[PDB]
Structure 1
């Protein structure tokens, strides 16, 4: 487990977001938790349940993937949001400033085992993000 969640929940908390808030808020889930503001982020308007199914679609492979050789793409499209740091010179939350960018595309994810103390029902769960199309 990561310091405050499982890998699979932490992955969801960053990127899986069926009914989000606006970007100035949505970004806080890392930009107010990490030592600097990240410039760009992506937030898929889907359910974790679909993403657990996407870690049971046929196995493909991704750009930065050699330590598992396994990722997958979604079989039909979903809505999303993207966010954008409007002045790259902010490094902290007293000055970092953003705006919204909604969209509908497929997505690409990597995946690994369950957690000893959470939701055993599913042997393999998502855990990272590569791109959207």
Structure 2
């Protein structure tokens, strides 16, 4: 969540991308938010709206929070991307390689209160991606 992108709008930036390029570069503009590299990421080929609408569906128990239900699983199967840090122990966004694996399924995103200056229409927005099922 850089000083240019919010916590949500920035989440979909790396967690969402209609046309997910080479995980190698696709992890550039994103990682640019921090100095370290990510251990995993999933870019769902869909618009933020299609994601925010999922936060209004029957919530369920999230994997990252076995004691909380602040997330919601996608109702309709959509084409998403699943990448992983193929460089275990490497902390260089310059030489940080990422794996690529296409797939069409749901997605577990943690929705939370957003700022009225970024998402006026949508009340809640995704800030984390557990996985894609």
Q: TM-score scaled to structure 2, two decimals?
A: 0.82
* Separation of aligned partners in 2, 1:98 and 1:77: 24
Contact 1:27/1:83, CA 8 A, preserved across alignment: no
Q: What SS class does the counterpart of residue 101 from structure 2 fall into? A: strand
Contact 1:85/1:99, CA 8 A, preserved across alignment: yes
Which 4+ runs in 1 deviate beyond 4 A?
A: none
Larger radius of gyration: 1
Measured on the aligned residues, the alpha-carbon RMSD in Å equals 2.4
Q: Which moved more, 1:7-16 or 1:118-127?
A: 118-127
Deviation track 1:10-35 (CA, whole Å, cap 9, x = no partner) reads: 11112011122211111113444423
Unaligned runs of 5+ in 2: none
* Separation of aligned partners in 2, 1:71 and 1:84: 22
Deviation track 1:55-76 (CA, whole Å, cap 9, x = no partner) reads: 1111222133378632111111
Q: What SS class does the counterpart of residue 65 from structure 1 fall into? A: coil
Unaligned runs of 5+ in 1: none
Aligned in 2, Cα 1:119/1:132: closer, same or farther, shift over 3 Å?
closer
Q: TM-score scaled to structure 1, two decimals?
A: 0.82
